[PDB]
Amino acid sequence: KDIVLTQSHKFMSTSVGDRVSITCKASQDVGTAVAWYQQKPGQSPKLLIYWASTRHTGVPDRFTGSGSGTDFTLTISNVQSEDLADYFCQQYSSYPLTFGAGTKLEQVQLQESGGELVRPGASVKLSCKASGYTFTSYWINWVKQRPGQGLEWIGNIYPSDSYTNYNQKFKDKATLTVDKSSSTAYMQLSSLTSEDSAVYFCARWGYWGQGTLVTVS
């Protein structure tokens, strides 16, 4: 059974200066293979914490993470205006990678392209141009985010040899490939329906692309 992460507060209210804690409980033991992300409207998720309690490069000391096993916590000590955003936990213990549903608090580069209007039933090809690091040394992941909804992992690919892993839910709907020469990863989706309309992100450890919007209509 897929690992389910539960963040019990879709919304949390706070005031500038306050301390806030958001929790995430895993349906299964995930060791400390948990990451926390911040995401603001119209922007891509930003990595805050990984391995449950390690702060990512450039994240203010205001953010701390803790926990192991099934219970994890993200704490922001002295809330600032710029911290008002959605927060998501994610586990990377085993496939399929999964995310919590989100809590709304109130030189590496990946450039995506390809998103547009597409006719139902047809196919679309999304691209993700990687730069600023060695393309063949990091797994590239693709994630789907339907407007106003949460994150769903589609699958990943190792560029050196194109080994792939797919979320069973997407096993034939999508195919992942790369072009080593231009450092770009691609994802093609077939038999499109409105359930496929969404923003699609490519991401490697630590960095997400800006997202590309696919609209089936």
Nearest 5°: phi and psi at 181? -55, -40
Determined by X-ray
Strand partners, 184: 129, 179
Nearest 5°: phi and psi at 170? -115, 5
Residue 11, classified by CB atoms within 10 Å of its CB into exposed (0-12), middle (13-18) or buried (19+), is exposed
CA-closest candidate to residue 135, choices 188, 214, 202, 216 = 202
Architecture field, domain 110-208: Sandwich (2.60)
The token pair that represents 126 in the structure block: 């999304």
Q: How many CA atoms lie within 13 A of 56 on its CB side?
A: 14
Strand order of the sheet with strand 184-189?
109-113, 124-131, 184-189, 174-179
Nearest 5°: phi and psi at 198? 175, 175
Give the Cα separation of 195 and 174 in Å (integer). Answer: 14
What are the angstrom distances between the C-alpha of 197 and each of 117, 146, 159, 189, 212?
Answer: 9, 7, 26, 11, 11
Residue 184, classified by CB atoms within 10 Å of its CB into exposed (0-12), middle (13-18) or buried (19+), is buried
Return the ∠ at Cα 35 (arms to 197 and 146), rounded to 5°: 10
Domains 2-109 and 110-208 belong to one CATH topology: yes
The token pair that represents 40 in the structure block: 């603001």
What are the angstrom distances between the C-alpha of 57 and each of 32, 65, 111, 119, 192?
Answer: 19, 14, 20, 41, 38
Nearest 5°: phi and psi at 130? -95, 145
**CB atoms near residue 207 (< 10 Å):** 18
Q: How far is C-alpha 177 from the geometric centre of its chain's CA atoms?
A: 19
Q: How far is C-alpha 170 from the geometric centre of its chain's CA atoms?
A: 16
What's the CATH class of domain 2-109? mainly beta
Domain definitions of the chain by residue range: 2-109, 110-208
CA-closest candidate to residue 86, choices 56, 43, 57, 146 = 43
**CB atoms near residue 16 (< 10 Å):** 10
Strand duo 86-91 + 34-39: pairing:
antiparallel
Largest interatomic CA distance in the chain? 51
Strand partners, 75: 21, 64
- Three-state secondary structure string covering the chain: CCCCEECCCCEECCCCCCCEEEEEEECCCCCCCEEEEEECCCCCCEEEEECCCEECCCCCCCEEEEEECCEEEEEECCCCHHHCCEEEEEECCCCCCEECCCEEECCCEEEEECCCEECCCCCEEEEEEEECCCHHHCCEEEEEECCCCCEEEEEEEECCCCEEEECHHHCCCEEEEEEHHHCEEEEEECCCCHHHCEEEEEEECCEECCCEEEEEC
